Design a protein around this ligand. Structure first.
Ligand code: NAG
Ligand code: NAG
Ligand code: NAG
Ligand code: NAG
Ligand code: NAG
Ligand code: NAG
Ligand code: NAG
Ligand code: NAG
Ligand code: NAG
Ligand code: NAG
Ligand code: NAG
Ligand code: NAG
Lengths: 135, 135, 135
């Protein structure tokens, strides 16, 4: 990347800011901005690129061959019983949460068994998380 | 990427801002902005690219060959009983949540077994998460 | 990367800021800004790149061959019982949370068994986490 910006409230290249309950009198603002931006990004000069894959099997005997890729999720149990018995009782459940396997962002590239790759891979995440807000 | 911006409230290249309950008197604002932007992004000069895949099998004996790709999700159990028994009781369930496997964003590229890839892969995520808000 | 910025509230290249309950009188602001930015990023000059993979099997005997990739998640149990018995009782559950395997951001590149890779891999994360807020 080049420029990544996270700003909580206010972003301003030039800010003449006046807030509340203010007396703004006899003001002379003079501004000159000569701003130049020149970007040359991701320039490639390749005369020749070779990607080569060769597989040869000759009068061979192969048996019981197994190949398994990544993220092999097998025999997984989630068990969340909730047994609530009541007798002459007062429950005030204002904000009660039961969350299981709650994803927000899942991003995947190039999850393989055999990969031959040339170039650029980029991931950017910006956010504001706020799970529970009980006023 | 080049320019990624996250701004909570206000973005302004030039901001002459006046808020409430303000007296703005005798003001002379003079502004000159000579802004130039030049972008040259992702320029490629290839004289020759070869991607080559060759497979040869000759008088061979192959048996019990197994290939499995990624993300192999097998024999998975989710069990969330909720047994609520009641007897002379008062329940006030204002905001009660039971969430299982709640995704927001799932993004996938190039999830394969064999991949030969040239170029650019880019993922950008911007958001504001707010799961529960109970006033 | 080049420029990564995290700002809590306010970002300003030039800020003439006046807050509340202020008397702003007899002001002469004069500003000249000659700003130049020149970026040359990720320039490659390759005359020749070779990526080569060759596999040869000749009159061989192979048996019981097993290859397993990364992230092999097997035989995993989550057990979170919640047994709440009640008798002449008052419960005030204002903000009670039961969270299991709660992800926010999961990012993956190039999770393979065999990888041949040339170039750039970049990951950027910016956020503000706030799990529980009980006023
Ligand atoms: C504002 O400027 C003018 C001219 O410069 C001047 O006559 C005036 O008195 C100023 N304001 C005050 C409140 O003095
Ligand atoms: C910018 O503006 C001011 C305002 O008077 C001027 O004096 C100056 O010569 C200007 N410069 C450029 C580079 O534009
Ligand atoms: C890429 O193109 C030619 C190839 O040799 C080279 O002379 C030139 O300087 C390169 N371009 C840049 C912007 O560097
Ligand atoms: C391996 O081969 C034997 C017999 O040759 C067979 O019983 C077994 O199931 C095989 N295992 C796999 C994983 O293929
Ligand atoms: C505003 O400016 C004019 C001319 O510069 C001036 O006559 C006037 O008095 C100023 N305002 C005040 C409130 O003084
Ligand atoms: C910008 O505007 C000001 C206003 O008077 C002027 O003096 C200056 O010469 C200008 N410059 C350019 C580069 O436009
Ligand atoms: C790509 O085109 C030619 C090929 O050699 C090269 O001379 C030129 O400089 C390159 N373009 C840029 C913008 O670099
Ligand atoms: C492997 O081969 C044996 C017999 O040769 C067979 O019983 C078994 O099911 C095979 N396993 C697989 C995974 O193909
Ligand atoms: C503001 O400036 C003007 C001219 O410079 C002047 O006459 C005036 O008295 C100033 N304001 C005050 C409150 O003195
Ligand atoms: C910037 O502006 C001031 C304002 O008078 C001027 O004196 C100066 O010559 C300017 N310089 C450039 C480089 O623009
Ligand atoms: C890449 O292109 C040619 C190749 O030799 C080289 O002379 C040139 O200086 C390079 N470009 C840059 C911007 O360095
Ligand atoms: C290995 O081979 C034996 C018999 O040759 C078989 O019983 C066993 O299941 C095989 N194991 C695997 C992992 O393939």
């Amino acid at each position: 990347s080049i420029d990544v910006k996270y700003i909580g409230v206010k972003s301003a290249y030039v800010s003449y800011d006046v807030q509340k309950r203010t007396i703004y009198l006899n003001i002379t603002n003079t501004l000159n901005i000569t701003n130049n931006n020149y970007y040359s990004v991701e320039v490639e000069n390749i005369t020749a690129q070779v990607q080569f894959s060769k597989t040869v099997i000759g009068k061979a005997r192969l048996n019981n061959i197994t190949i398994i890729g990544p993220l092999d999720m097998k025999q997984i149990d989630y068990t969340v019983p909730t047994v609530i018995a009541e007798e002459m009782s007062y429950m005030y459940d204002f904000c009660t949460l039961i969350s299981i396997k709650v994803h927000n962002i899942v991003l995947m590239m190039q999850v393989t068994v055999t990969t031959t790759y040339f170039g650029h891979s980029e991931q950017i995440s910006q956010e504001r998380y706020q799970y529970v807000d009980c006023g």
